[PDB]
Amino acid sequence: GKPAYQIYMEFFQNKQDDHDPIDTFVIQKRALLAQLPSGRHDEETELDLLFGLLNIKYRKHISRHSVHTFKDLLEQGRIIEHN
Amino acid sequence: GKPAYQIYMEFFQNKQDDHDPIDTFVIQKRALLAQLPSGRHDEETELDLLFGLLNIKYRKHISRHSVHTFKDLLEQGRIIEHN
């Protein structure tokens, strides 16, 4: 696979744009995370890597400390896209 | 301290510019890494996070697989700034 350093750069290269649902943004980013060495990062760390790339439309409502899992983040983000 | 997600964003926000010696670029980035939870990342992972942010003037000569430690990276980079 791709070297890890190149995955990290690609992960951080693109922030979530206004047109991009949280589900599809998260799928794309988690696909990059899955190419890193198995067992390197726990879910908390993966969420820490991803959180700041989320669009402000989510972060205004959901802070990092409010979610512990990707499932939580997606649940809340979907409501936000409907609220 | 700062939340981890904010550290990661700050770490990836600025690539190494032409005017910036490798020593001072690395010190700045490692100061961010030191604010993450102790024991989260090993040196290999830290190098993987940092490598792609190095200026192409180093990466043309030094590939990721050639270095195993920050000490190696700095040793080689200093020679490159003199070669």
Residue numbers in the entry:
A (entry chain A), B (entry chain A): 4 to 86
Quote from the publication.
One of the key proteins in long-term synaptic plasticity and memory is the activity-regulated cytoskeleton-associated protein (Arc). Drosophila has two isoforms of Arc, dArc1 and dArc2, with low sequence similarity to mammalian Arc, but lacking a large N-terminal domain. Both dArc isoforms are related to the Ty3/gypsy retrotransposon capsid, consisting of N- and C-terminal lobes. As opposed to the corresponding mammalian Arc lobe domains, which are monomeric, the dArc lobes were all oligomeric in solution, indicating a strong propensity for homophilic interactions.
Each monomer consists of five helices in an orthogonal bundle fold, and the structures are highly similar to each other. The dimer interface is in both cases formed by α1 and α3 from each monomer, and the total buried surface area at the interface is ~1400 Å2. Both interfaces contain four hydrogen bonds and four salt bridges. The interface is conserved, displaying only three conservative replacements between the isoforms (A125/L170/F172 in dArc1 to S112/F157/Y159 in dArc2). (D) A comparison of the dArc-CL crystal structures with the same domains in dArc capsids. Both the dArc1 and dArc2 C-lobes closely resemble their counterparts in the capsids, with an all-atom RMSD of 1.75 Å2 and 1.13 Å2, respectively. The dimer interface in dArc-CL, which corresponds to that in retroviral CA-CTD, contains mainly hydrophobic interactions; half of these hydrophobic residues are polar in the rat Arc-CL, and the first helix of the dArc-CL, a major part of the dimer interface, is tilted away in mArc, possibly explaining the monomeric state of mArc-CL in solution. CD spectra of the dArc C-lobes are similar but differ in intensity, suggesting that dArc1-CL is less folded in solution, despite the very similar crystal structures. Kratky plots also indicate that dArc1-CL is more flexible than dArc2-CL.
